[PDB]
Write a protein that binds this DNA or RNA. Structure first.
Ligand SMILES: [Mg+2]
Ligand SMILES: [Mg+2]
Ligand SMILES: [Mg+2]
Ligand SMILES: [Mg+2]
Ligand SMILES: [Mg+2]
Ligand SMILES: [Mg+2]
Ligand SMILES: [Mg+2]
Ligand SMILES: [Mg+2]
Ligand SMILES: [Mg+2]
Ligand SMILES: [Mg+2]
Ligand SMILES: [Mg+2]
Ligand SMILES: [Mg+2]
Ligand SMILES: [Mg+2]
Ligand SMILES: [Mg+2]
Ligand SMILES: [Mg+2]
Ligand SMILES: [Mg+2]
Ligand SMILES: [Mg+2]
Ligand SMILES: [Mg+2]
Ligand SMILES: [Mg+2]
Ligand SMILES: [Mg+2]
Ligand SMILES: [Mg+2]
Ligand SMILES: [Mg+2]
Ligand SMILES: [Mg+2]
Ligand SMILES: [Mg+2]
Ligand SMILES: [Mg+2]
Ligand SMILES: [Mg+2]
Ligand SMILES: [Mg+2]
Ligand SMILES: [Mg+2]
Lengths: 122, 72, 175, 49
RNA sequence: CUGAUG
RNA sequence: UACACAACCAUGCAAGAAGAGACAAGUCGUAACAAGGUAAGCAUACUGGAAAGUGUGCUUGGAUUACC
RNA sequence: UAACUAAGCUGUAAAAAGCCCUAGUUAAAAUAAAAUAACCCACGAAAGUGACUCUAAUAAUCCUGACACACGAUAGCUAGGACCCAAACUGGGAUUAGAUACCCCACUAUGCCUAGCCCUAAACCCAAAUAGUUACAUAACAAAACUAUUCGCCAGAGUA
């Protein structure tokens, strides 16, 4: 996976969520991207009341879309997702797997710095 | 210590600023009078060129614009 | 201008066998379409070093460094054409141009044939640094224009006088 | 090896045919990424409850 | 809270 | 023979304008040297008889007394 | 900006002035700025930068080197836009013999965005760059004393 779409859909019914995800993935496939997988993180309580599309959202369904897309459609996908009233807050980031987990060496013992003052007798 | 000379330069600059504020327009008159003579000297130095080169009048298509009298 | 195709199959996945046997869904992800700008930079650098240079393995050569900096200069120009107020990239470009010109001077002083071929292939017009670097102000520009026009008028009137004298001599030698 | 691994991932991609299947699959198979840690350096997952 | 000079 | 021919400078004077300096003593305030009694100073802008005051950034050529 | 409650709210060592279209709670756009993380010291040539995400990208197979070129915080100017909040100036209320100041309230330019200028700082880490040494060696303090090639400066102070 290259990119990652965190989608926050409005709390709605099962066929409505299905159609919303269908049209979102259809738009992402029309914009020139192949969808790898889709993961539903469950309908949880929002940490804060989000106000979007003149609506006070208290809950929201979280979705995770990992895919590959060119660098020229990231803004177009965001502009398409922003105007959707069923989308509360969309986010397009890099997938955390493309950053290889470098070797966490550990707590390197750092000594106390010396030679900071002259040897003059006080 | 060094604040002596610092405050000395501060007082001198403050007095200079006050003098400029008190005699602002006289300084502008002097500046205009100097720029006028500057443009006149430039015009005469240009006119001397073709006269020492042999030309009686100025070359064709020569206007000699004002480079010092440019408005803000 | 160079136009890398979207299905270029970038160098990281080009020399390995079995690249044309996979399907289009895999080729399109292993191509330049889903790639970033650094991949296009690498592709342009490879395609320029394979056609302009003679030994692409000798990267430590001045002729190779000039091409590697020319690619970056053209990329920075492409960036400037979109971003006007970008000062850091503008300084990068203006200093990379000076470094490329210094290496061009060194190449011209070392090997004339390679320098002349690099210039003809890359379109870089090597200019000689004009001595007496001065800021041309309005007074100097006006006086130089006046002196040039005076010189032209003086030589024109002298040519006309010489023509009139030649005609008067030809009319006097005949009768 | 990277090309061969990507070839296997192309088998489970979402397409026009698999769209209606993957939608109803993800809407019925939720996932969770919450996992805590301990002072010794071991992880725990709330899926054991 | 404020209190100038030699 | 046909043209510019005191314009350009230098030397003195000038009705006058402004500044700097020394020159025992004045008038009006206390600006800084002590957290100089509002901590200073730099760039800049405004204001005030005056030293100066204030605003925006910047340095300590000041401390915050050091298991407090 | 609307709804409930009260005649009070803000304000200093103490008050006065100001507001009583005020004050508290519940909701609420637009603008400005970006708690803790930071006991971190990274990025960038410097000024500068630490609310989140995306694209581009951070020169030199790497010496020094201008009056040339390109940048250069805040503050200032021009045109258009924005204005919660703070505030040059200004108008009031305190204190003082006086206070056109430090204290309190209101308010403007301005701080905010785009385009174009101005190119200034205690632009200080007051310690120039390039590769090194711990040899001789404490004017004083401060950040210990120094090498080889350089660039730019330094001739008492005020006048400046
Ligand atoms: Mg003086
Ligand atoms: Mg005190
Ligand atoms: Mg005092
Ligand atoms: Mg004071
Ligand atoms: Mg004071
Ligand atoms: Mg006082
Ligand atoms: Mg002091
Ligand atoms: Mg101050
Ligand atoms: Mg000042
Ligand atoms: Mg004031
Ligand atoms: Mg005030
Ligand atoms: Mg001190
Ligand atoms: Mg009252
Ligand atoms: Mg508003
Ligand atoms: Mg913040
Ligand atoms: Mg650095
Ligand atoms: Mg580098
Ligand atoms: Mg150099
Ligand atoms: Mg305003
Ligand atoms: Mg206010
Ligand atoms: Mg007042
Ligand atoms: Mg401004
Ligand atoms: Mg500036
Ligand atoms: Mg600084
Ligand atoms: Mg210095
Ligand atoms: Mg001693
Ligand atoms: Mg140097
Ligand atoms: Mg002198």
């Amino acid at each position: 996976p290259r990119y990652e779409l965190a989608l926050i859909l409005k709390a709605m019914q099962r066929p409505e969520t299905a159609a919303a995800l269908k049209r979102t993935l259809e738009a992402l496939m029309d914009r020139g991207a192949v969808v790898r997988n889709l993961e539903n993180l469950g309908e949880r309580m929002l940490p804060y009341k989000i106000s979007a599309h003149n609506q006070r959202h208290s809950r929201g369904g979280y979705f995770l879309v990992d895919f590959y897309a060119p660098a020229t459609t990231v803004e177009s996908m965001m502009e398409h997702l922003s105007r959707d009233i069923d989308v509360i807050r969309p986010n397009i980031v890099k997938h955390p797997l493309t950053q290889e987990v470098k070797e966490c060496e550990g707590i390197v013992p750092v000594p106390l710095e010396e030679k900071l003052y002259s040897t003059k007798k006080r | 210590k060094n604040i002596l000379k610092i405050r000395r330069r501060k007082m001198n600059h403050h007095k200079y600023r006050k003098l400029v504020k008190r005699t602002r327009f006289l300084r502008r008159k002097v500046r205009e009078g100097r720029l006028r003579q500057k443009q006149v000297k430039f015009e005469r130095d240009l006119k001397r060129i073709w006269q020492k080169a042999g030309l009686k009048e100025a070359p064709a298509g020569w206007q000699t614009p004002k480079i010092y009298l440019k408005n803000q | 201008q160079d136009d890398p195709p979207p299905s270029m199959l970038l160098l990281d996945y080009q020399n390995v066998p079995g690249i044309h046997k996979v399907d289009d869904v895999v080729k399109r992800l292993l191509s330049l379409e889903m790639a970033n700008q650094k991949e296009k930079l690498k592709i342009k650098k490879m395609q320029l070093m394979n056609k302009v240079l003679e030994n692409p393995e000798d990267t430590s050569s001045l002729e190779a460094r000039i091409v590697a900096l020319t690619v970056k200069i053209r990329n920075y120009e492409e960036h400037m054409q979109k971003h006007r107020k970008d000062k850091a990239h503008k300084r990068f470009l203006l200093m990379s141009i000076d470094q490329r010109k210094k290496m061009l001077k060194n190449l011209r002083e070392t090997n004339y044939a390679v320098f002349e071929k690099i210039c003809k292939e890359l379109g870089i017009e090597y200019t000689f640094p004009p001595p007496y670097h001065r800021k041309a102000h309005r007074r100097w520009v006006t006086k130089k224009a006046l002196c040039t026009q005076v010189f032209r008028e003086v030589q024109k009137l002298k040519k006309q006088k010489r023509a009139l004298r030649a005609a008067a001599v030809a009319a006097h030698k005949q009768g | 090896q990277e090309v061969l691994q990507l070839q296997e991932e192309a088998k489970t991609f979402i397409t026009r045919e698999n769209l209606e299947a993957r939608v109803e699959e993800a809407l019925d198979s939720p996932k969770s990424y919450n996992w805590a840690i301990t002072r010794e350096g071991l992880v725990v997952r709330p899926q054991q409850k």
